[PDB]
Amino acid sequence: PQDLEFTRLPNGLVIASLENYAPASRIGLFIKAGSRYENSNNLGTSHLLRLASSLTTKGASSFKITRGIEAVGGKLSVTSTRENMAYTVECLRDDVDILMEFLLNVTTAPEFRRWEVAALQPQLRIDKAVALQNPQAHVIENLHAAAYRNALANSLYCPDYRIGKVTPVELHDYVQNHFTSARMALIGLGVSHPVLKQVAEQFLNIRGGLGLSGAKAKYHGGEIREQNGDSLVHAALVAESAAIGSAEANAFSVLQHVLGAGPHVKRGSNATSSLYQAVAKGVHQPFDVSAFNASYSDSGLFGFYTISQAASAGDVIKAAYNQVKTIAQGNLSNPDVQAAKNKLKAGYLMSVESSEGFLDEVGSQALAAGSYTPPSTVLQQIDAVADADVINAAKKFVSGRKSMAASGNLGHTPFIDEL
Amino acid sequence: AALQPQLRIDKAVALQNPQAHVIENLHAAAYRNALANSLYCPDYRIGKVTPVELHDYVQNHFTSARMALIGLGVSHPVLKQVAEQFLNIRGGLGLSGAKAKYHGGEIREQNGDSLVHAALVAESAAIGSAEANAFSVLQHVLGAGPHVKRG
Amino acid sequence: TATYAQALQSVPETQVSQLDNGLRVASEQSSQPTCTVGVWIDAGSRYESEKNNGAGYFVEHLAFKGTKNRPGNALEKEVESMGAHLNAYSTREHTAYYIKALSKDLPKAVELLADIVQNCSLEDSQIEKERDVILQELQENDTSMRDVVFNYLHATAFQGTPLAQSVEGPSENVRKLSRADLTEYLSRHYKAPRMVLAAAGGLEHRQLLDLAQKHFSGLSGTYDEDAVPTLSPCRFTGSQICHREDGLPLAHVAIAVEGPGWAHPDNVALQVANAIIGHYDCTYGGGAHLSSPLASIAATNKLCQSFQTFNICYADTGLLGAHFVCDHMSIDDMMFVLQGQWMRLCTSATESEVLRGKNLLRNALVSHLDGTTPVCEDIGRSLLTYGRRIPLAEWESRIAEVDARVVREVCSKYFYDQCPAVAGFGPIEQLPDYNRIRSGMFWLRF
Amino acid sequence: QLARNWVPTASLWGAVGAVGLVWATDWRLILDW
Amino acid sequence: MTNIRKSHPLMKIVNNAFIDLPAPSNISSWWNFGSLLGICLILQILTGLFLAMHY
Amino acid sequence: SHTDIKVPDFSDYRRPEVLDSTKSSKESSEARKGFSYLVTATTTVGVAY
Amino acid sequence: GRPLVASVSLNVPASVRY
Ligand code: HEM
Incomplete structure (x- = not known):
């Protein structure tokens, strides 16, 4: 029905809402406090904080919550990343208000009881373990550790020596410092603006204070290698791209879909991807190659994450890597550019359609921009990408300092000096 | 197989002095191929030791060219007798393919302990040189072992 | 609005x-x-x-x-x-x-x-x-x-x-x-x-x-x-199978009892039951305070790492049963505490607890319809299945059918005193011998 | 909690005892055949 | 062992020396004389008693 | 691999009420069990007297 | 590639993504 209405407050906390036809009614709350805000002695907090949502509020016992939510048949979620933690909550058309009532108490009115914290400690290992079964996880978290110094290198998970080290104070301080009414965004979906507009101004107005931005992340060289028994090497090779919110940040997204291969056809080895094809010719039986691009506020990284066997690992990299040079040499096809941009438009629009998927991208703009951009504008911004720009941008990757991480049997692995 | 669990018990009591654990990282930073190898068995490798691996590494790097037998308090001839008998095998020898190829790098690690350790190293020269002698001169100028207790 | x-x-x-x-x-x-x-x-x-x-x-x-x-x-x-x-x-x-x-x-x-x-x-x-x-x-x-x-x-x-x-x-x-x-x-x-x-x-x-x-x-x-149409009803064989392998760390189990086909009234009632017994996993933020009586107990002692209930309905036939993983010393204690649930349903169930089951179904049914493909995918099977019917609002109307006497008349059919189908994968060893299970389906009123 | 079942069941077991209890001793009685 | 009635009085865990006592599969009838001694023993003591009252 | 498993025929041991492959067990089921218990409950009569 | 990654704790389900 009506389109996006987003309303600043005097407090600075953005709110926005739509009115849907569906019995589906969901709310979300975004906050700027991610991993990058954990400090040296402060480590592992966020990864605990994210498990504590069921603990006792100020007003309501932890029991009444959990039985309460399920009786309604609601659902509560939590999500983190290197940047923005988001408490998502969803229920039926009718009951939202009781559930809108709890959402505040959790983030508004925390209480951490030392006897209710200590019982939760062992949970981390159980959590940490099931996360790293996919080493494609465990490769990444090493990567950031190689490519930075101060901030972004922080883990999304709690290092092990740090386990018994989490005191309630540490929590109770990190609560109030990085939670504030300037840094928060509340987003409804199926609910009328005014009802949403009412309660938010009441409870969520606190200070002031602290956004402390002191993280410039200072991209800086490095590499990390690791030797395990597994028979399949993984590899990442990355150079520094530019920050989010730039035609470059747009340009790289163009560049990946040229090379970057997600499977578009089940079991189909992607022939449109020059990269995976440029390799497979001169090489042998299983392997995989994909471009890897992610961008954050102050900076973003670009590279390609590969998988092979121990023997081929040496060639796979050199083969794929020089293939990029070819593009940096001016070799290009405007149809592919025209083809890629089509994929991008495709990849983006199909990504948004789902409510949840839609819901995330809403506030993603909010904490960053504070406005909303209709997808049309995105589209018109997409095609603005110049050809030489793409080339010139890729000329930055090859021409600049690089980093690496590898986990597995390394016997044949090249180093960054041989590249 | 019965001896396997012994390693962990051995490995543990070794690293209580991190002045150990700093070093073994160091070589890993300053080389590529050979010297970087540990004196201890990495953990994923524990259950991985087959007798064959042993029984091969026995005969390859043991040989009568590479061995030296030294007595102290015993007459030469008695010593001289038995050695020629048993210890004469091959041949084969010596697999020198390690040039160690000094190469840059560094390693950093974050633990909870409140006392940082640090090493800073550049490549000196090989043993058996006036330089290898010269460095030994250079250390005792700067290099401090305690010569006076508590001093 | x-x-x-x-x-x-x-x-x-x-x-x-x-x-x-x-x-x-x-x-x-x-x-x-x-x-x-x-x-x-x-x-x-x-x-x-x-x-x-x-x-x-x-x-x-x-x-x-x-x-x-x-x-x-x-x-x-x-x-x-x-x-x-x-x-x-x-x-x-x-x-x-x-x-x-x-x-x-x-x-x-x-x-x-x-x-x-x-x-x-x-x-x-x-x-x-x-x-x-x-x-x-x-x-x-x-x-x-x-x-x-x-x-x-x-x-x-x-x-x-x-x-x-x-x-x-x-x-x-x-x-x-x-x-x-x-x-x-x-x-x-x-x-x-x-x-x-x-x-x-x-x-x-x-x-x-x-x-x-x-x-x-x-x-x-x-x-x-x-x-026409190569198709023909199938027999139900109460049986057991055990692949006993003592290397692996954990031991799967699956128990099941046969149930009706696609189009049938009882297909709804049973949708709700398996919501009530609920499901637990290692990694939830539930804790020991959860409502699902198997998500409270098996979370307390971690009697089982995780389990889910499945429901599958073929043309003329359907399967009801759960799937749980647990360590070998523990396997007995699941089986008992499981059969506690099915048997307390078929007699002692209650109006209040129905709701928390009833609601969730309304929840999941709707949230299943977000996105292009999940809708389309549904339409595809439906035509082959129920005919053209996409009875969206009717679902709700079919739900309010569910009442206390509805459930206990439905589950009295398929559960109480039947022949289960057990299939397991080693280290099964402690999983009781068959004639225990069959003797555990029907309360003697204990 | 207003127990629904177990009102029917107990009523049977009440007979199960008494009927049985009549059968154990069973002195005076009405029907024969 | 959640609400298993076999723990709660301890004496019943002593009574899982019977019920779950594992046994071989193949057992000839010749192993029935394990029990039939016992029952021939009990049946004595009673019938052995009600003689005493009049002896 | 594993799927090579296939179940042997127990037909000899069955009783023909369930013998057919194409039939619903639920038709015979009612009586099929109804006999077995009749054995059990009958037995207890004897012990009782 | 990856998002890069994510994590989902919550209550009723649980998982990780990329
Ligand atoms: C292993 C247990 C027992 C054995 C093998 C046993 C054996 C016997 C035998 C062989 C006789 C003589 C049979 C006869 O005279 O006709 C007898 C008589 C008797 N037994 Fe036992 N008996 C046992 C237990 C008992 C017990 C537990 C009692 C008392 C509670 C008991 C009380 C008597 C008496 C009073 C007699 C004399 C009655 C009679 O012999 O007519 N016996 N018993």
């Missing part, structure tokens, strides 16, 4: 159409720039013979490998041209080709999707490329304890019917399979009325039906006989 009852009422309704040779059409309009176009065939495994066994999953690969008009890897480069993703998957009762794409390129979409369904280049160059990939997948598929243990479960309960067999079939057929049978299998099962077209997105109906039309009006897609 929208109130819970009102929100049901404004939805784009089902559209339906016929062609002459028995093909069907259907659609919905979401006012959306993207669209799912697909095909849903009822040709399953339970049709296939003992020699043809596995051919279906075999065929499933070749379609995208190039075809009559567009040889090998000329096809894909057009799909990647559009940037549209492309997908296919199989199931014992169904096979599905479908595409997610912009509403714009639809003219090629069908005409592409059209060709693949019937005209397929069959070249033994591809076959031997294929016959490895499968003989690659079979031996690996041991690695996933889950998918295996089910293949135990069917074979042990249904033994002696075409439904009792693997999807991919035993390995030996994969070797011997020649494209003669395929063409025969192709010829038999791909005619309409079997086939069904569907879609949802910016499409409406008309603008589809004209470009439904001409091949396939069509390449037929025929209607003659192929007898």
Whole structure:
């Protein structure tokens, strides 16, 4: 029905809402406090904080919550990343208000009881373990550790020596410092603006204070290698791209879909991807190659994450890597550019359609921009990408300092000096 | 197989002095191929030791060219007798393919302990040189072992 | 605005159409720039013979490998041209080709999707490329304890019917399979009325039906006989199977009892029960305060790492039962505390607890309808299943049927004093001998 | 909690005892056949 | 062992020396004389008693 | 691989009421069990007297 | 590639993504 209405407050906390036809009614709350805000002695907090949502509020016992939510048949979620933690909550058309009532108490009115914290400690290992079964996880978290110094290198998970080290104070301080009414965004979906507009101004107005931005992340060289028994090497090779919110940040997204291969056809080895094809010719039986691009506020990284066997690992990299040079040499096809941009438009629009998927991208703009951009504008911004720009941008990757991480049997692995 | 669990018990009591654990990282930073190898068995490798691996590494790097037998308090001839008998095998020898190829790098690690350790190293020269002698001169100028207790 | 009852009422309704040779059409309009176009065939495994066994999953690969008009890897480069993703998957009762794409390129979409369904280049160059990939997948598929243990479960309960067999079939057929049978299998099962077209997105109906039309009006897609319909009820064999292997760390179990088919009133009542007993996993933020009586207990002592209840309904038949993992010293204590639940339902159930079950179903049913494809995917199977019916608002009306006496009259049928089907995968050893379980289904009032 | 079942069941077991209890001793009685 | 009635009086865990006592599969009838001694013993003591009252 | 398993025939041991492959067990089921218990409950009569 | 990654704790389900 009506389109996006987003309303600043005097407090600075953005709110926005739509009115849907569906019995589906969901709310979300975004906050700027991610991993990058954990400090040296402060480590592992966020990864605990994210498990504590069921603990006792100020007003309501932890029991009444959990039985309460399920009786309604609601659902509560939590999500983190290197940047923005988001408490998502969803229920039926009718009951939202009781559930809108709890959402505040959790983030508004925390209480951490030392006897209710200590019982939760062992949970981390159980959590940490099931996360790293996919080493494609465990490769990444090493990567950031190689490519930075101060901030972004922080883990999304709690290092092990740090386990018994989490005191309630540490929590109770990190609560109030990085939670504030300037840094928060509340987003409804199926609910009328005014009802949403009412309660938010009441409870969520606190200070002031602290956004402390002191993280410039200072991209800086490095590499990390690791030797395990597994028979399949993984590899990442990355150079520094530019920050989010730039035609470059747009340009790289163009560049990946040229090379970057997600499977578009089940079991189909992607022939449109020059990269995976440029390799497979001169090489042998299983392997995989994909471009890897992610961008954050102050900076973003670009590279390609590969998988092979121990023997081929040496060639796979050199083969794929020089293939990029070819593009940096001016070799290009405007149809592919025209083809890629089509994929991008495709990849983006199909990504948004789902409510949840839609819901995330809403506030993603909010904490960053504070406005909303209709997808049309995105589209018109997409095609603005110049050809030489793409080339010139890729000329930055090859021409600049690089980093690496590898986990597995390394016997044949090249180093960054041989590249 | 019965001896396997012994390693962990051995490995543990070794690293209580991190002045150990700093070093073994160091070589890993300053080389590529050979010297970087540990004196201890990495953990994923524990259950991985087959007798064959042993029984091969026995005969390859043991040989009568590479061995030296030294007595102290015993007459030469008695010593001289038995050695020629048993210890004469091959041949084969010596697999020198390690040039160690000094190469840059560094390693950093974050633990909870409140006392940082640090090493800073550049490549000196090989043993058996006036330089290898010269460095030994250079250390005792700067290099401090305690010569006076508590001093 | 929208109130819970009102929100049901404004939805784009089902559209339906016929062609002459028995093909069907259907659609919905979401006012959306993207669209799912697909095909849903009822040709399953339970049709296939003992020699043809596995051919279906075999065929499933070749379609995208190039075809009559567009040889090998000329096809894909057009799909990647559009940037549209492309997908296919199989199931014992169904096979599905479908595409997610912009509403714009639809003219090629069908005409592409059209060709693949019937005209397929069959070249033994591809076959031997294929016959490895499968003989690659079979031996690996041991690695996933889950998918295996089910293949135990069917074979042990249904033994002696075409439904009792693997999807991919035993390995030996994969070797011997020649494209003669395929063409025969192709010829038999791909005619309409079997086939069904569907879609949802910016499409409406008309603008589809004209470009439904001409091949396939069509390449037929025929209607003659192929007898009718190769189908026949299946027996239920109360049995057991144990693959006892003491190496592995953990021991799976699956227990099940047979249940009704797709279209049937009791299909709703049982949907709700398995919501009430609920499910637990290692990693939830639930804790020891959860409501599900097996999510409170088995979380307390971690009697079992995780378990979920499944519900599967075939044409004339359905399966009810759970799937749980636990360490070997612990396996007994699950089985008892499990049979506590089913048996306290069939007698002692209660009005209040019903609600928390009833609500969740309304929740999941609706949230299942977000997104283009999940809607379309539903439409596909529905037509083959219940007929045209997409009784969205009616669901709610069917729910309020559920009452205390509804449940306990329903579950009294299928649970109390039956013959279960147990299938397990080692270190099973402590799992009690059969005649315990059968003696644990029926309270003596203890 | 207003127990729904177990009102029917107990009523049977009440007979099960008494009927049985009549059968153990069973002195005076009405029917024979 | 959640609400298993076999723990709660301890004496019943002593009574899982019977019920779950694992046994071989193949056992000839010749092993029935394990029990039939016991029952021939009990049946004595009673019938052995009600003689005493009049002896 | 694993799927090579296939269940042997127990037909000799069954009783023909369930013998057919194409039939619903639920038709015979009612009586099929109804006999077995009749054995048990009958037995207890004897012990009782 | 990856998002890069994510994590989902919550209550009723649980998982990780990329
Ligand atoms: C292993 C247990 C027992 C054995 C093998 C046993 C054996 C016997 C035998 C062989 C006789 C003589 C039979 C006869 O005279 O006709 C007898 C008599 C008797 N037994 Fe036992 N008896 C046992 C237990 C008992 C017990 C537990 C009692 C008392 C509670 C008991 C009380 C008597 C008496 C009073 C007699 C004399 C009655 C009679 O012999 O007519 N016996 N018993």
